[PDB]
């Protein structure tokens, strides 16, 4: 089969990691000690993508859990489904990085990195035909961001030809008070633009606004943000996990979604938006996922163009209806689709609906609007760095200033590259 190896790192990576496994295990119909008790054979057809086989017909997440904090490890083992992870697959450090990227990437992270690689090798080597890797992490802390991007460099060295996928959570002042996040993020993006094939942009600014503004949540928690992140992750991996024609593995998705090697950052979308504790039509579904309010990155799609889009509809609905509505959507919105990439929206229909939803929609867009997110990160980075603030935290670890410049301007190049393709015409 075509196995994915999952890696979660830092507090965030591990929170969203766990929910993902909670959700998809439910979907595939398996209990907290890994026994199948589902009612449909489609739950097992491609179960190996995400799970190994055990004795006694026990299924085990192909997952590797990492943090420089030993703490989050225990709070993972405590949650539901904490008892399913292979116990050798936990790899924890001593200190914690305390929001310092350089610690994550060069020093403390480096010292732990080799022991992570060992578990990755163990998993990989067993694999019949490994498709590649997915990493969940945040970009504002020190472990998820710095150690996570180191891990990625290191894995790409040993598996140069497998696909490398991240779920990257981007920082917002609205959610974390740390002044230093724009540093951790810019240095992260610098690594990702070189070393990942596809990166899902989960923006905490977007997730906060949906929870406050749309979902009526009063003071929204992390659990509240993570509810959205897991719905999204379930949606974007459906195609990987159940049988189907379209984007059925990582390379096929990349090939459909990434027209230029550096433009590999997607805004995901979902409809209907909900929180925990209490049906749309095909046309509402369809209109909603092309709407700025349903985007997990804080970008207005009407401020750019799509290079490529995948849509995934779930639930027992009419295929002819989805086809019509999808055509409809492209006709009424033709301006926002680059004309020089024909037939650039693809559509998948999966009968299996998610949890307590009769029908839903997930959207994955490679839009030139995502530059908004980078420009915002850029404005923050440069507010400080100009007044060389807090630099001492990083240089102290051996980093030169130059590395900051290079990363700043690699992300500027990126922005201006999106703009270039937003502007291009057919003649």
């Amino acid at each position: 089969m075509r196995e994915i190896v999952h890696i979660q790192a830092g507090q965030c990576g591990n929170q969203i990691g766990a929910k993902f496994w909670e959700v998809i295990s439910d979907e595939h119909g398996i209990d907290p000690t890994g026994s199948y008790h589902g009612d449909s054979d489609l739950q097992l057809e491609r179960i190996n993508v995400y799970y190994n086989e055990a004795a006694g017909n026990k299924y085990v997440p192909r997952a590797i859990l990492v943090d420089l904090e030993p703490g989050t490890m225990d709070s993972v083992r405590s949650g539901p489904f904490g008892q399913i992870f292979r116990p050798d697959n936990f790899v924890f450090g001593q200190s914690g990085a305390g929001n310092n990227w350089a610690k994550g990437h060069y020093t403390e992270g480096a010292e732990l990195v080799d022991s992570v690689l060992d578990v990755v090798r163990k998993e990989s080597e067993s694999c019949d035909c490994l498709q590649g890797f997915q990493l969940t992490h945040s970009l504002g802390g020190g472990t998820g961001s710095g150690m996570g991007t180191l891990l990625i460099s290191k894995i790409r060295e040993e598996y140069p030809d497998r696909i490398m996928n991240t779920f990257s959570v981007v920082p917002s002042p609205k959610v974390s008070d740390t002044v230093v996040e724009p540093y951790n993020a810019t240095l992260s993006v610098h690594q990702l633009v070189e070393n990942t094939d596809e990166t899902y942009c989960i923006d905490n600014e977007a997730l906060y606004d949906i929870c406050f503004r749309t979902l009526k949540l009063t003071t929204p928690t992390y659990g509240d943000l993570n509810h959205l992140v897991s719905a999204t992750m379930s949606g974007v991996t459906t195609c990987l996990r159940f049988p189907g024609q379209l984007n059925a593995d990582l390379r096929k998705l990349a090939v459909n979604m990434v027209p230029f090697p550096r433009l590999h950052f997607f805004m995901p979308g979902f409809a209907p938006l909900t929180s925990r504790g209490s049906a749309l039509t095909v046309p509402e579904l369809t209109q909603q996922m092309f709407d700025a309010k349903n985007m997990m990155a804080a970008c207005d799609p009407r401020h750019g163009r799509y290079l490529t889009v995948a849509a995934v509809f779930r639930g027992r609905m009419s295929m002819k209806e989805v086809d019509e509505q999808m055509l409809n959507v492209q006709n009424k919105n033709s301006s926002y689709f680059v004309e020089w990439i024909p037939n650039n929206v693809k559509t998948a229909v999966c009968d299996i609906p998610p949890r307590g939803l009769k029908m839903s929609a997930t959207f994955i867009g490679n839009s030139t609007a995502i530059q908004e997110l980078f420009k915002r990160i850029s404005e923050q980075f440069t507010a400080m760095f100009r007044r060389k603030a807090f630099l001492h935290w990083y240089t102290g670890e051996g980093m030169d200033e130059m590395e900051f410049t290079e990363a700043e301007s690699n992300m500027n190049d990126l922005v201006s590259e999106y703009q270039q393709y937003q502007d291009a015409t057919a003649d």
Partner: protein, 440 residues
């Protein structure tokens, strides 16, 4: 005495292969275990169906067929399906990792890992033939295996079999069912690579078949199974001349003589009639004239293009079932004199016709009505060039910005291969223009 070997390549080739073999079994009275009660020669014979099936001493009739995919899940269904006892496991070849919609992987990276094994299994089939006629290759233009593997295979078969004819049935991509944005790239690359190696190619436009299912069979959202059943009828009409014999049967190679005026101009347009559901056929024979005229209606074509805006260079008709010469002659004379059909001035305006008495069959639980008489027409029209122009334009839109090109370069290709392929297509389009201009 002339065996044909079928090669089914990638998901489309393979799935169309099952539909075709299933249907051939039904046509010839061969059961899913290979036994054929009505065949009195056990272990061999030189009957007409032996061009497509060999025979074991145990009386099993085995397809002269290889199935190839770079990934196992499609062929796995054939290994465990209804027809799993039809094929020797050696005729079913799979790798572990597919071409990811990327011609470059099917041709070089992944394909090169399995090409000698495939040649090898083909050579086992060739070796059991007393008078090997050639090959029929089934494959999509759009997939990575369908495109890059097939073209690699075609190159190597030219080297290992020189003489031997090779016919293609190629699935041409449609947006209603396609799965890759780079399908225009794969299609232009495979056409350029395959053009010198193929003798005759039948394009099946997935949009044309999709629409025929919607409109003539009232299927709301046609699936592969739906399209493959219809496509299987067209393929069967075309191979019928090799699989049966009869006093009025004209052999596929004779049609070929008429259909290919110049080596590069070898893409016939197929039109099939009647495609009619059971409910609508109840209390309705369509006569010879009716089904014949229906070959000149573009809604029945298997590529979208318009022959009323181009010129014919050949026109062949393959009738099956309850059909007699008096009626064919009369129906064609009518079309002639009703002047609806224009030939290039360098080509006589005749109609080569064949008739096989065997009536068409349908697979159980399908959507096609079973009819008395059907007809497949093969024409060579300058209009088939339209299909190439639509693809060439999509190619051009993407390639001017090098969109997606990095995926091919990362697998070893050079931009030079792209522009060389596309120039070859520009030339093919000039060719179909030149043959249509009046002589001096």
């Amino acid at each position: 005495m002339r065996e044909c070997i079928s090669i089914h390549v990638g998901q489309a080739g393979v799935q169309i292969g099952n539909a075709c073999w299933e249907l051939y079994c039904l046509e010839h009275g061969i059961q899913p275990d290979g036994q054929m009660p009505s065949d009195k020669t056990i272990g061999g014979g030189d009957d007409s169906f032996n061009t497509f099936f060999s025979e074991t001493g145990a009386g099993k009739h085995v397809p002269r067929a290889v199935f190839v995919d770079l990934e196992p899940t499609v062929i796995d269904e054939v290994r465990t399906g209804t027809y799993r006892q039809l094929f020797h496991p050696e005729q079913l070849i799979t790798g572990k990792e597919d071409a990811a919609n990327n011609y470059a992987r099917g041709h070089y990276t992944i394909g090169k890992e399995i090409i000698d094994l495939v040649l090898d299994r083909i050579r086992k089939l060739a070796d059991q033939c007393t008078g090997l006629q050639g090959f029929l290759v089934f494959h999509s233009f759009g997939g990575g295996t369908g495109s890059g593997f097939t073209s690699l295979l075609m190159e190597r078969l030219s080297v290992d079999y020189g003489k031997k004819s090779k016919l293609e049935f190629s699935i041409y991509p449609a947006p209603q069912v396609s799965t890759a944005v780079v399908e225009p790239y794969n299609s232009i690359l495979t056409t350029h690579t395959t053009l010198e190696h193929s003798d005759c190619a039948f394009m099946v436009d997935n949009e044309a078949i999709y629409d025929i299912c919607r409109r003539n069979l009232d299927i709301e959202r046609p699936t592969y199974t739906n399209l493959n059943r219809l496509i299987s009828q067209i393929v069967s009409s075309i191979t019928a001349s090799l699989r049966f014999d009869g006093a009025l049967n004209v052999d596929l190679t004779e049609f070929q003589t008429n259909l290919v005026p110049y080596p590069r101009i070898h893409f016939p347009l197929a039109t099939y009639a009647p495609v009619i559901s059971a409910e609508k056929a109840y209390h309705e024979q369509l006569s010879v004239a009716e089904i014949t005229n229906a070959c000149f209606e573009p809604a029945n074509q298997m590529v979208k293009c318009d022959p009323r805006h181009g010129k014919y260079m050949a026109c062949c008709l393959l009738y099956r079932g309850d059909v007699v010469p008096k009626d064919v002659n009369a129906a064609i004379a009518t079309i002639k004199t009703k002047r609806s059909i224009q030939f290039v001035d360098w080509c006589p305006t005749g109609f080569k016709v064949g008739i096989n008495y065997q009536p068409p069959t349908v697979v159980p639980g399908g959507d096609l009505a079973k009819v008395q008489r059907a007809v497949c027409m093969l024409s060579n029209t300058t209009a088939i060039a339209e299909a190439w122009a639509r693809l060439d334009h999509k190619f051009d839109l993407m390639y001017a910005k090098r969109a997606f090109v990095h995926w091919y370069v990362g697998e070893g290709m050079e931009e030079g291969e792209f522009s060389e392929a596309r120039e070859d297509m520009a030339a093919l389009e000039k060719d179909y223009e030149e043959v249509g201009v009046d002589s001096v």
